[PDB]
Amino acid sequence: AMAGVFTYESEFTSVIPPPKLFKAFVLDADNLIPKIAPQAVKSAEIIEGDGGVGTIKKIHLGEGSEYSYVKHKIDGIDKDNFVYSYSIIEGDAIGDKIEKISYEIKLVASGGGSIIKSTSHYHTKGEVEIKEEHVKAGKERAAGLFKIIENHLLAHPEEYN
Ligand SMILES: Oc1cc(O)c2c(c1)O[C@H](c1ccc(O)c(O)c1)[C@@H](O)C2
């Protein structure tokens, strides 16, 4: 029956500045990734909402994740300060051990690069197993994807200006 929340903090740098990165990784992620990283993600669609806060999206994952869905709940967007927060509410790692996973992502200017500050909140249930390796994975995973994006924009500077 026991509820809890485990909360983890992570950072990535990028040479791409916030406002470009933001448009690519947040605002256009849904079409972009599927185009440049099919193994990551096949497609993404709005199930519910108006696209703003409170929208839910079914995201169709790629082979990397045995073609499994997740549903994302948009918790907030601030297009000015480059903040985005969304919770995974169904899908891959959302079992019994763990019931929602929530992210706040904050892009910070840093020398015409960015630092991507990421807070994740694993909403637990029952006993709490959290392995230094389960965290390293999920972290590598996210960074793998920012790297795909960063390198994509470096090779396509015509995009997201
Ligand atoms: O290989 C994977 C496995 C996953 O569970 C996920 C992956 C990639 O990336 C998905 C992802 C992450 C950020 C996104 O904007 C996105 O559209 C899709 C993430 O929610 C879940």
Residue numbers in the entry: -1 to 159
Paste lines from the article:
Fra a proteins are members of the pathogenesis-related 10 family and are required for the normal accumulation of flavonoids and the development of color in strawberry fruits. PR-10 proteins belong to the START superfamily. These proteins adopt a helix-grip fold with an internal cavity capable of binding hydrophobic ligands. The data presented here demonstrates that Fra a proteins bind natural flavonoids, providing for the first time mechanistic insight on the function of these proteins in the control of flavonoid biosynthesis.
In the case of Fra a 3, crystals were obtained only in the presence of catechin, a natural flavonoid present in strawberries. The crystallographic model contains five protein chains and six molecules of catechin. All of the molecules of Fra a 3 in the asymmetric unit showed additional density inside the cavity. This density could be easily interpreted as (+)-catechin. The catechin molecule inside of the Fra a 3 binding cavity is stabilized both by polar and hydrophobic interactions and shows the same conformation in the five copies within the asymmetric unit. The flavan nucleus is oriented with its long axis approximately parallel to the helix α3 and with the B ring pointing toward the bottom of the cavity. The catechin molecule adopts a linear disposition with its long axis approximately parallel to the axis of the long C-terminal α-helix of Fra a 3. It is stabilized by polar interactions with the side chains of Asp-28, Ser-63, His-70, Tyr-84, and Arg-139 and backbone atoms of residues Gln-37, Ala-38, and Gly-60, whereas the non-polar groups of catechin are surrounded by hydrophobic side chains including Ile-31, Val-39, Leu-59, and Leu-143. In the Fra a 3 structure, the loop L5 wraps around one end of the catechin molecule and approaches the C-terminal α-helix (α3) on the opposite side restricting the access to the cavity. At the same time, helix α3 of Fra a 3 shows a slight bend at its center toward loop L5, whereas loop L3 approaches loop L5 and the ligand. This closed conformation is stabilized by interactions with the catechin molecule.
